[PDB]
Amino acid sequence: GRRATVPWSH
Amino acid sequence: GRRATVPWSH
Amino acid sequence: GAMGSMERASLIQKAKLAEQAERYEDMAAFMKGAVEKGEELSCEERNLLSVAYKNVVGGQRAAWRVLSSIEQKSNEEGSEEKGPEVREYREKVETELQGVCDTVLGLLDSHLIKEAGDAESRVFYLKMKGDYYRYLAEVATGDDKKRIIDSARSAYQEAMDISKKEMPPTNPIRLGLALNFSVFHYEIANSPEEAISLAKTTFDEAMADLHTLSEDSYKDSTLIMQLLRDNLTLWT
Amino acid sequence: GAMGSMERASLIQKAKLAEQAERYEDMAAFMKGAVEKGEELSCEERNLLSVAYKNVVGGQRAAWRVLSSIEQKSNEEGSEEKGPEVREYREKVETELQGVCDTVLGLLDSHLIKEAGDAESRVFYLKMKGDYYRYLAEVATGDDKKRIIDSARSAYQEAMDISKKEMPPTNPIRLGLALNFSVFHYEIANSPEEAISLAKTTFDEAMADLHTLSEDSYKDSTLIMQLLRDNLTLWT
Ligand SMILES: [Mg+2]
Ligand SMILES: [Mg+2]
Ligand SMILES: [Mg+2]
Ligand SMILES: [Mg+2]
Ligand SMILES: [Mg+2]
Ligand SMILES: [Mg+2]
Ligand SMILES: [Mg+2]
Ligand SMILES: [Mg+2]
């Protein structure tokens, strides 16, 4: 499992 | 299920 | 062409790297560069060309279907007018798709088909010609629609005639040609009975020839035979 | 710009259609056109911009990692020399990736950040600036590597300072900023302890504020909190 990052605010 | 078509020979 | 300065072997190597990286636009550009070197393509190289362009046009076709569905819903009674944007953007995707089809057809006409003398190469390229005219037919609505459909049919028919004379009924190229020409009959030519007949006859003749094959050839042929069966199950 | 003749509202409409069609390059081009109209972006429009470019650069980053892995294997003892092609193609993908990052950073600098006065917009854009410097840092190997890393850090830090002063600990923008800055610490800045501390403190402070939220806000916040927990589980 690759670590998580996000692009969205919600 | 969408009908099947192929691009490759093998 | 932008690939004119790169070695043929380097273009092939980079096409394989692009495939591994899931960079199918790059893959197709590399393979177009390789074709334009003017030499015939090996079996592996023909499959790189086909896989690359199929992935490119497959994304465009899926996008076109999404946009076409939205456009049709906007043209139902009770739908609010939203302006020209849906049509414009569907047309943009459509024009890009047609350009890719024209590029592939251009490579086949200049000069892959005319130099292809062995049955395996000639059938492969004629199947491709039928496929890319079929993709043009999926989006065609005007004065040339019938001629586009007939161009697909004629290419498929010549490929079928060669494949039946020169290849065993289990040959994977022959099987995939029949699969695709059957889909052409079903959903382009409005001939579902011809589509079903072709798929059934192709499956049954392949079944009878499986006993002649090695384990690895058997695996190749039965995989495509299962796709014929899948379509028959969907259609009956 | 090629989008200069299209209405702002039409660009936004087409960005949403492109998203539905999974045409993320088009989506990003439409949103760049909308930004270049010069007006501030609403919350929804900021998220369209972020989603579009993240999908574009995400494909490039995944491809770069595939090619970089192949290139490293070719540089092991016992690997056969295959020529310059792997390096050249990795460099091609890398240059395209850097160009997309520079495009996003350019939009932020001209002039999204300077006009963003509300905490939600300013934090959003500063997080984006940190993210796109972070993507540049992932591929950087030269004299500017340290300055690229510090540019990401500085943008994230300003966003963190604003978010802690002006937003509740459950705010989804604040949570996603912390998630990404924690990953920056772990894998860019070689500071796994800072990464773990940040993720844990962010999770715990959000947990304590969940009681203030509606059901729908609770769902938004707990989703990102689960990503913080997922990273902590991976890292401990
Ligand atoms: Mg040469
Ligand atoms: Mg048209
Ligand atoms: Mg020949
Ligand atoms: Mg023969
Ligand atoms: Mg206007
Ligand atoms: Mg470089
Ligand atoms: Mg303002
Ligand atoms: Mg506040």
Residue numbers in the entry:
A (entry chain B), B (entry chain B): 590 to 599
C (entry chain A), D (entry chain A): -4 to 231
Task: Quote the original article.
The hub protein 14-3-3 is an endogenous regulator of various NRs, providing a novel entry point for small molecule modulation of NR activity. An alternative approach to modulate NR activity is via their protein–protein interaction (PPI) with the hub protein 14-3-3. These 14-3-3 proteins are known to interact, and thereby regulate, hundreds of different, mainly phosphorylated, protein partners. In the case of ERα, 14-3-3 binds the phosphorylated penultimate residue T594 in the C-terminal F-domain, thereby reducing E2-dependent transcriptional activity. Exemplified, 14-3-3 binding to the C-terminal F-domain of the estrogen receptor alpha (ERα), and small molecule stabilization of the ERα/14-3-3ζ protein complex by the natural product Fusicoccin A (FC-A), was demonstrated to downregulate ERα-mediated breast cancer proliferation.
